[PDB]
Ligand binder design. Structure first.
Ligand SMILES: COCCN1CCc2cccc(N)c2C1
Ligand SMILES: COCCN1CCc2cccc(N)c2C1
Length: 150
């Protein structure tokens, strides 16, 4: 009973989380996951500011209201070569990564490691935060509040 949460640097408080390194988060789970980081799903405005500070990924993830990919550099295999906050229009499926927004983060780029999942609740899952530099923090707990996500 183990979950890896791979987390990025924060940019104006916005970061990306993937569960087990593959698209596997529903919209309800995404909200719960951000809540566990004392964070919320970003607004479009929040994501645009993060982009302006250097944030880009090659992953679809939830924000409030849409699924998006922030792009700075055009790449043919990431958001069909678009730049800016690319909005997913047409998809059959419901599971993506998520973005999260932590208002208490620094205003620009913060690439220090994440060492806590401060708002996880009691539970039986070994949850491991994995930073890009390999630094890990584990705890026993849970964050999913919807049964359909478990
Ligand atoms: C209100 O949350 C109830 C569900 N949680 C409550 C806390 C908890 C602790 C250890 C194992 C499990 N399964 C659980 C389940
Ligand atoms: C946005 O990056 C998607 C690719 N994955 C690749 C695997 C991985 C491992 C640990 C932390 C992070 N951020 C990542 C990122």
């Amino acid at each position: 009973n183990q979950i890896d949460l791979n987390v990025t640097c924060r940019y104006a408080g916005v970061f990306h989380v993937e569960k087990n390194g593959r698209y596997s988060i529903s919209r309800t789970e995404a909200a719960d996951l951000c809540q566990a980081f004392n964070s919320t799903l970003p607004t479009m405005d929040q994501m645009k500011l993060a982009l302006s500070k250097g944030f880009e990924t090659c992953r679809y993830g939830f924000i409030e209201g849409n699924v998006v990919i922030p792009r700075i550099h055009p790449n043919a295999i990431c958001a069909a070569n678009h730049t800016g906050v690319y909005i997913l229009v047409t998809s059959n499926t419901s599971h993506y990564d998520t973005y999260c927004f932590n208002a208490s983060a620094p205003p620009e780029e913060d690439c220090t490691s994440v060492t806590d999942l401060p708002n996880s609740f009691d539970g039986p899952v070994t949850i491991t935060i994995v930073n890009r530099d390999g630094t890990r923090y584990s705890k026993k707990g849970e964050y999913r509040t919807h049964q359909e996500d478990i």
